[PDB]
């Protein structure tokens, strides 16, 4: 017994975001890896050095490749992290017990890889972004845009139910990121590989960054093997409701054996 | 009469370490700045780029110069942050209401600047470092050495009285640092006229195993302070295991003399 | 190939003062930045907003901060611009190939930061200032004084050997400045480890009547210089009366 | 005794632009005032504080107000400066020997005050502006637009015949201004009785690429002038590329219009 939980943070965050969850999963006798994606957390890479979703996901790809033949894992993707899980599932489908999407963007091998992002962008008026910074770092021929959450956006849309301490922590650690729309519109997931992995979506009822209605929409339109929900949780469930999240994850681990 | 508290982290940490304290001071109606020093927290610089204490303190020096004309601050330095405070005190003595040393290294204006650090290493057994890594990144004629706390040293000497969540956060954010001994041993950066003119306050953390209470008292007895406060039961990371008491202490000294 | 020259104007002037030199340096294949310091040239800040030498030097500090990872520059400071140079040298010592002080005030890390200015003020008789305006805008708690060159001081002491067009240009562009005496007398801007680790070069202007050749020589002897070059026949505004020689001199010390 | 020349710069420029011409006129024994209009040159006001041509021309109006009345002047307006000249001619017509429009915008009393600006734009392609910046700074119910020449625009449309030194100088001194289209379209300023009672001289710069010769001749032909002078081989910045030719022309008008 004892599974391996691979936790993948969202945009503008890093492995640190799982600091309240990690200890809980370990106490239950499980292995946990809360990695930093490229240019995230304490990774020295710069966001301008990332031109594709792959570059950004590289760290996860390297970890998945180091996994022992008999060391299956439970991938947990938060927010944009869901897109990162897609590449891992497409390349290492049989190394995944189940893919868990925590208030994340969950892709599929049916629509265009950027579909869920495009739908989100359309149902999201510019004002909702508040003080988020969107800046170009590519070229008119090869357009690249970076996304960097501002303090207002973090407090009103992502941490409205989190403690003032959690907000202070995030405000001193958030770094520029990117939705990698342009890159994702050029294609990356197939039925045979990506579509063979069980998907479990965890809904955060009070989520304002990625509203509950949009999460439901993804469950209905994209489809999942199972849908769970953490009532009273905002976008940052691993911070405002770590124990509930842990319980859910452990239940997933027991079920998808 | 709101106050501007400038919080300065210790070696291997960053502004994020003050995430529990910051909200408490602000709730009390004060302004707080928890900056990242060079190659710390999310700062993109690498430790190998820092050769002196000044290079490392650069972010603090920039903050001091950005201060309004008639705007003073209360400096709070933790651990190695005490040395950073020394440089700011020597350069902008009139811009500081008081310099608070929290379980920190506190220099003097009599011996060379590396004095207390040499005294610390000489009164503290090598075995106390546990898994901390000391690596050279300079040359035989221009020596440079980086210091990186390992998981054992962090859990056994710094966070022994902190929660498992706090230890998890530190393990995912810690980065290599340096005591900059080489640089500091070759000069006397502090003078009684500037550095020594700044009001000094020391906060002793009785259960500290990183910088033992005995050494803290020794530093106090080496130069003297305007006031010595004590936080009984706090380990090296007082802002994490005793944020409320620390906040109260800072609010008190914020009107003592 | 080709270097980046950062030109820093003196008191009451601005980036425009390098309009004759800038083209020459670029013609040689070099990048030139003739920035405006705070409350100078077309900058919108007012003199009463600058309380310290750092506030005045802010634009130079931002420029240095925006420099590429492995991008170095050659600083050229004129007149008061030398003091601005010192701050840049102290903060970014390793991004500077050499600091050129063109008939400028050049500090050291030994005495007070205002040392050379205090010495200058003690040799310079009140008569020499002519119609220059000195007005206070601070308080005894922190004394502040603005300095504004008058048309006569400009014509007799700074532009006596310059063309009538250049004098007209200056008269329509000069703005109040400050020597920041009091701020400097209590600050510790320069240290031997940083400011003093940067190669120093001094270009003396023989016919200078603003900062006389003797005072220029004194500063050179006071702290020492890696190389001291001289532009014979140039008044205080060497980039206006002798731009070509200045360019040649700068391209020479650009490696020698 | 020598006359008083009041030099009025164009948009994004300042008194400094007349630095080569000023000495020439003074050498001739004449008095010269190269003032800075509002938010121009070293003026501390910002373009966002100006919403009408009148606010922008304030400095000129203040200067005209201090004239002894027994002391007349010769107004020389360059580029957009010609519009500033109009307000002075309207308010102090009897204190002006003549108004000189150097490759400027010369208004009339018949059409809307923005007439010449509207015409200019109608025969000027949106690409002639190059890297020039047009930013809005007026509230939704009170539209206001700022104009800021870019380096390319200066080098290829205004200073194509000037020295590299003058381009370097202009680039380090240009500031944002405005054509004040909004204000000029609803505010009637000039009248035939006053503005029109002043003699107008237009100096054409044949090589002008900012305000092309054709439009300059268009204004002379449509708006009318007392006399038309021409400076062959000069770009938009005649006071920089041909200061001596311009000075001779000004001294000439200063003599026949006394
Ligand atoms: C994730 N961490 O949070 C949000 C919130 C709102 C919109 C996008 C995103 C991400 O891409 S990541
Ligand atoms: C500080 N953060 O913690 C410790 C602990 C033990 C020895 C040195 C140090 C520092 O320099 S920093
Ligand atoms: C410099 N531009 O010119 C002079 C001349 C005489 C005395 C002081 C100064 C400056 O501070 S700046
Ligand atoms: C004048 N200085 O230059 C130009 C050039 C082209 C179009 C307009 C204008 C001005 O309004 S001012």
Question: Would an 8 Å CB–CB cutoff place A53 in contact with chain B?
Answer: no
**Does B91 contact C at CB distance below 8 Å?**
yes
Would the annotation count B171 as a binding residue? no
**CA dist B237 to B21, B106, C27, Å?**
11, 17, 59
Q: Determine the angle formed by the axes of helices B53-66 and B81-91, rounding to 10 degrees.
A: 50
Ligand minimally distant from the alpha carbon of residue B235:
2
Cα-flanking dihedrals φ and ψ of residue D149, to 5°? Answer: -55, 140
The Cα D212–Cα A209 span in angstroms is 55
Chain-centre distance for alpha carbon D117:
12
- Distance, C-alpha D52 to centroid of its chain: 16
Q: Given its phi and psi angles, is residue A118 left (phi above 0), alpha (psi -120 to 50 degrees) or beta?
A: alpha
Q: Which residues of D touch C27 (CB under 8 A)?
A: 164
Hey, what are A177's tokens?
């990121």
C95 touches B at CB < 8 Å = no
Task: Kindly state the tokens that stand for D181.
Answer: 């289209």
The CA distance from D67 to D135, in Å, is: 37
Q: Which residue has the tokens 């002006």?
A: D96
Q: Is C223 in the pocket of ligand 3 (CB under 6 A)?
A: no
Q: How many Å apart are CA C42 and CA D155, to the nearest integer?
A: 19
Q: Are the C-beta atoms of residues D18 and D12 closer than 8 Å to each other?
A: no
Assigned token pair, D73: 């002047």
Ligand 3 pocket check: which of C8, C9, C11 to mutate, most ligand atoms within 8 Å of Cβ? C11
Token representation of residue B148: 């990186």
Query: What 3-state class would DSSP assign to B252?
Result: helix
Instruction: Return the CATH architecture of domain A1-257.
Output: 3-Layer(aba) Sandwich (3.40)
- Position of tokens 């009984």? B232
Experimental method: X-ray
Q: Look at residues C238, C63, C41, C204 and name the one whose alpha carbon lies nearest to residue D168.
A: C41
Chain B, 150-209: which have a CB under 8 Å from a chain C CB? 187, 194
Residue D4, beta-bridge partner list = D31, D73
Residue A79 marked in a binding site: yes
Q: Dihedral sign, CA of A125, A128, A131, A133?
A: negative
* Spatial CB neighbours of B68, under 8 Å, sequence gap ≥ 6: none
- Binding residue per annotation — B157? yes
Helices (H), A33-132: 53-66, 81-91, 115-122
In terms of CATH, what superfamily is D1-258? Alpha/Beta hydrolase fold, catalytic domain (3.40.50.1820)
Whether D5 and D250 have beta carbons less than 8 Å apart is answered as yes
Q: Measuring from atom 1 of ligand 2, which residue has the nearest CA? A: B79
| d(C-alpha C234, C-alpha C229), whole Å | 13
Closest C-alpha to C86, from C227, C219, C241, C252: C219
Both tokens of A251, joined, read 């239940």
Apex CA A49: angle with CA A45 and CA A53, to 5°?
Answer: 100
CB–CB contact C193 B52 (8 Å) = yes
Do C236 and C56 form a contact (C-beta atoms < 8 A)? no
Check A16 against B20: CB less than 8 A apart. no
- Sorted by where each begins, the domain ranges of chain D are 1-258
Residues 6+ apart with CB under 8 A from A62: none
Task: Give residues after which chain A gaps, C-N over 2.5 angstroms.
Answer: 187
CA-to-CA distance for B6 and A249, rounded, in angstroms?
40
- The answer to whether the CB atoms of B91 and C188 lie below 8 A apart is yes
Contact A1, A27 (CB under 8 A): no
Regarding the beta carbon of B11 and ligand 2, being less than 6 Å apart is answered yes
> Residue D206 burial by CB count (10 A; 0-12/13-18/19+): exposed, middle or buried?
middle
Out of A22, A23, A165, the one facing B23 most closely (by C-beta) is A165
Ligand 3: which of C9, C53, C79 to mutate, judged by most atoms within 8 Å of the beta carbon? C79
Q: How far apart are CA C216 and CA C221, in angstroms?
A: 9
Q: How far is C21 from chain B (nearest CA, A)?
A: 32
The residue in chain B having the minimum alpha-carbon distance to the alpha carbon of residue C54 is: B65
Q: Which of A136, A114, A127 is closest to A53 using CA atoms?
A: A114
Q: Which positions ≥6 away from C185 have C-beta within 8 Å?
A: C112, C113, C114, C118
CB atoms within 10 A of CB D109: 17
Q: What is the DSSP string of D181-245?
A: HHHHHH-----TTTGGGS-EEEEEETT-TTTTHHHHHHHHHHH--SEEEEETT--S-HHHHSHHH
- Give the nearest partner residue to D22 out of C23, C36, C168, using CB atoms: C168
d(CA A134, CA A136): 7
Complete DSSP assignment for chain C: ---EEEEE--TT--GGGGTTHHHHHHHTT-EEEE---TTSTT----GGG--SHHHHHHHHHHHHHTS-TT--EEEEEETTHHHHHHHHHHH-GGGEEEEEEES-----SSS-TTHHHHHHHHHS-GGGGTT-EEEE-SBTTB--EEEE--HHHIIIIISTTS-HHHHHHHHHH---B---HHHHHH-----TTTGGGS-EEEEEETT-TTTTHHHHHHHHHHH--SEEEEETT--S-HHHHSHHHHHHHHHHTTT-
Using a threshold of 3 CB pairs under 8 A, tell whether chains C and B touch. Answer: yes
DSSP label at B16? G
Chain B hits for A40, CB-CB cut-off 8 Å, are none
- Tokens matching residue C139: 């308080």
Tokens 């329509």, residue?
A: C172
Answer whether D85 contacts ligand 4 (Cβ < 6 A).
no
CATH topology of domain C1-256: Rossmann fold (3.40.50)
A9 catalytic, yes or no? Answer: no
D157 is in an annotated binding site: yes
Q: Are C173 and D44 within 8 A, CB to CB?
A: no
Q: CA–CA distance from A246 to each of A45, A105, A205, D139 (Å)?
A: 31, 20, 17, 52
For residue D146, the SS3 value is: strand
Q: Does the beta carbon of C212 sit less than 6 angstroms from any atom of ligand 3? A: no
């Amino acid at each position: 017994e004892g599974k391996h939980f691979v936790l993948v943070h969202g945009a503008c965050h890093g492995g640190w975001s799982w600091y309240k969850l990690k200890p809980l999963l370990e106490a239950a006798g499980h292995k946990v890896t809360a990695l930093d994606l490229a240019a995230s957390g304490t990774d020295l890479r710069k966001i301008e050095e990332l031109r594709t979703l792959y570059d950004y996901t590289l760290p996860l790809m390297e970890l998945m490749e180091s996994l022992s033949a008999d060391e299956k894992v439970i991938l947990v993707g938060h927010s944009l992290g869901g897109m990162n899980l897609g590449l891992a599932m497409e390349k290492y489908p049989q190394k995944i017990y189940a893919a868990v999407f925590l208030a994340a963007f969950m892709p599929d091998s049916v629509h265009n890889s950027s579909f869920v992002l495009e739908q989100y962008n359309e149902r999201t008026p510019a004002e909702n972004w508040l003080d988020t910074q969107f800046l170009p770092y590519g070229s008119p021929e090869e357009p690249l845009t970076s996304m960097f959450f501002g303090p207002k956006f973090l407090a009103h849309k992502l941490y409205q139910l989190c403690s003032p301490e959690d907000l202070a922590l995030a405000s001193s650690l958030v770094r520029p990121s990117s939705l990698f729309m342009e890159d994702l519109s050029k294609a990356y997931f197939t039925d045979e590989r990506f579509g063979s992995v069980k998907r479990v979506y965890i809904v955060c009822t009070e989520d304002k960054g990625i509203p509950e209605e949009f999460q439901r929409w993804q469950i209905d339109n994209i489809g999942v093997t199972e849908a769970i929900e953490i009532k009273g949780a905002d976008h940052m469930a691993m911070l405002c409701e770590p124990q509930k999240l842990c319980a859910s994850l452990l239940e997933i681990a027991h079920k998808y054996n």
